[PDB]
Amino acid sequence: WDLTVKMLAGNEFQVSLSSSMSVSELKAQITQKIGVHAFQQRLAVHPSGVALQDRVPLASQGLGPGSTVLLVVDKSDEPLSILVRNNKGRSSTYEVRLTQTVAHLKQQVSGLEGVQDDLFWLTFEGKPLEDQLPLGEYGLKPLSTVFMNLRLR
Template identity: 35%
Template structure:
């Protein structure tokens, strides 16, 4: 058997949870466990090593624990932040445009930004991400849209 790491995650208020995970587990997957346990959206979680949380940059979502050299039992501090702004790429048949959004923005808010920039009426825009069509009333985090990921813009033609 390959070796597991015991990870204890603490909140500033003193609550903690412990999980045994494989070193190949990503920070994003660990945040998923925290979200299940404490209902804090992954986007609002910042994890830092408890030893010096102030100087340490937060652990990056895409990295595994092993990538951070964490092969032993560790204590992580969970800091909650406001959802951060992120850039997404919106690609249509001609070009790719960068938009700045928050995970908590709705799909409709993104469509309104696209309208402001590209003058395509909101009701003619169809947006897809990882093969799913995005519905106006849902937020971007509902679809797990990642920073710097690509959303495809298709146009609905009138009368169709």
């Protein structure tokens, strides 16, 4: 596929897709092309205006080759506090921004806890956080609790 992305000024660009591609892959390509984090993208089908559905195949929601989606970018990025609970069950508070990468948070937790950052990983609502992704990818909210998990050696 090749898909048209239309922004508020009316400017357009193209993104290369496929039949097995999900909204997540679509947003990834958009980040590739314009440098906006996936969690900051607000997308809808043109010109129906229907929001894109995260769990549903692009092809199952009226998109195909030549289609156009509308993009609005939401760069609101005020600080919030979250908690990271260590192996001993002590929670500590961290001021973060959702645009900050997981690797960035790990550096903060590493300093506070005294554990090298290669010796733990973080989880939220069960799933592991990937170093290179922004915190906002994971839908962290004010006072959300992330879990520190120690790498055994």
